[PDB]
């Protein structure tokens, strides 16, 4: 078991780090007991009145989509060029 996990230790820890950072990014800034103040403030703000998952303007969104399409085309072209110069393909 130790050998199997240790082979992929980097990936497992990076997933763990993602989960922990996401968990503490969405937490109120106050630690319990004090978190009661944050809860009361949030409830009051809801009654009286993001870094991730953000919505983009249409022009910027289209520019990003075209940029990613160009990157994908370059990646596929490099893959094709690598395939052509391989030993088996040359043979």
């Amino acid at each position: 078991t130790f050998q199997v996990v240790q082979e992929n230790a980097d990936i497992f820890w990076k997933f763990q780090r993602y989960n922990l950072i996401v968990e503490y990014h969405s937490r109120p800034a106050l630690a319990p007991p004090f978190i009661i103040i944050s809860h009361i403030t949030q409830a009051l703000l809801s009654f009286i009145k993001d870094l991730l998952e953000r919505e983009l303007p249409s022009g910027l969104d289209q520019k990003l989509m075209t940029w990613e399409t160009v990157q994908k085309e370059n990646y596929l072209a490099k893959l094709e060029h690598e395939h052509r110069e391989s030993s088996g393909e040359r043979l």
Binding site: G59, T66, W67, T69, V70
Partner: protein, 374 residues
């Protein structure tokens, strides 16, 4: 006549233009292009000829051509000359240039799609006639069939609209040839205390017998031509004639009739045959790009420009722009085989600027080659 265009449609694109007459000096238009619009002297000019016929390119051929042209032009500052009307291969080339511009994170080098279009072929030209300096003319984008009148391509940044000539109705081709020749005679400043020419190439895709006069005019102006192998029209005629190796009147007329049934006129076919005969007779200014075989447009472009320069002169100062293109495209083998052969004599002072360019741009093979060559 300097006006800006606000393109309404899919994306808010801006475009400048200048109305010109058939008798205008190409020097004034180049001056306007450089200073009045801020376009730096380009390091490569590719002029798109043909592609306006009803017989369009196959999607694989069209995509390969546009992608290869844009990627070859992305290394340095290149101008792509088209008939800036939203139709045919011009529209797709504009789309590819647009896509590269959106995806480019380096605005230092720019690919500019400059259009040279007839004023009698622009849809809603009176709409853009206003061209107020404070208020750019609003121009709607309309996709239209083959027809006879198109709209300016929104993806072309700059336009050169040429009015019809009362004497002869061929002002557009003459203006294109004059601009290409004037650009080819230009000499931009290079680095420090140096100047370089601007490489000019013509790309032909599915020509019609009508542009043969302009093609021969450009050939006479020592401007190299590049021909798409499977383009569809005159391009197949030219590539087949080169494949045979010999061109005679009988074979020329046979191919011309076979690929163009509609053309049936003794004097006209004789003129076309003679034009083609002279075009092939030049030969050194013509090259074939077969995407099945070559599939690397930068290599073919560099080979064509080097062949034209070799047939032109033997001085090293004339090979400097071809060398710059070779450095930018990492074509060390072509440079060694052709540019740095025994035919051309290279001095140490001639290679200082390209040595700096290879050093700054991380081209160790060219650094080694320049050390090897003096």
């Amino acid at each position: 006549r300097l006006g800006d265009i606000d393109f309404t449609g899919v994306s808010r694109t801006r475009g400048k233009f200048v109305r010109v007459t058939s008798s205008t000096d190409p020097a004034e238009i180049y001056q306007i292009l450089t200073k009045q619009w801020g376009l730096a002297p380009p390091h490569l000019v590719v002029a798109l000829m043909g592609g306006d016929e009803v017989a369009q390119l196959k999607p694989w051929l069209r995509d390969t051509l546009r992608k290869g042209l844009v990627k070859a032009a992305q290394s340095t500052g290149a101008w792509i000359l088209t008939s800036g009307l939203r139709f045919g291969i011009t529209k797709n080339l504009g789309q590819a240039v647009r896509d590269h511009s959106l995806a480019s994170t380096s605005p230092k080098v720019r690919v500019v799609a400059i259009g040279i279009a007839p004023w009698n072929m622009i849809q809603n030209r009176d709409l853009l006639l206003s061209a107020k300096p404070d208020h750019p003319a609003t121009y709607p984008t309309e996709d239209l069939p083959y027809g006879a009148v198109y709209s300016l391509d929104c993806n072309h940044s700059h336009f050169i609209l040429v009015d019809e000539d009362p004497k002869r109705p061929g002002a557009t081709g003459e203006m294109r040839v004059k601009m290409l020749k004037h650009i080819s005679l230009q000499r931009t400043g290079y680095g420090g205390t140096g100047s370089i020419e601007i490489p000019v190439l013509c790309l032909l895709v599915h020509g019609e017998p009508r542009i043969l006069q302009k093609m021969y005019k450009n050939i006479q102006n020592s401007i190299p031509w590049l021909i798409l192998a499977g383009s569809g029209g005159v391009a197949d005629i030219l590539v087949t004639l080169m494949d045979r190796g010999c061109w005679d009147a009988d074979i020329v007329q046979e191919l011309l009739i076979n690929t163009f049934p509609d053309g049936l006129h003794s004097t006209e076919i004789t003129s076309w045959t003679k034009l083609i005969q002279r075009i092939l007779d030049h030969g050194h200014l013509l090259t074939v790009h077969d995407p099945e075989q070559d599939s690397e447009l930068d290599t073919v472009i560099l080979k064509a420009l080097v062949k034209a320069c070799k047939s032109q002169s033997q001085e090293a100062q004339d090979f400097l722009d071809e060398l710059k293109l070779a450095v930018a495209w990492n074509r060390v083998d072509i440079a060694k085989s052709e540019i740095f052969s025994g035919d051309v004599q290279w001095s140490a002072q001639d290679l200082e600027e390209v040595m700096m360019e290879a050093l700054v741009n991380d081209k160790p093979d060219f650094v080694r080659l320049f050390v090897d060559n003096g």
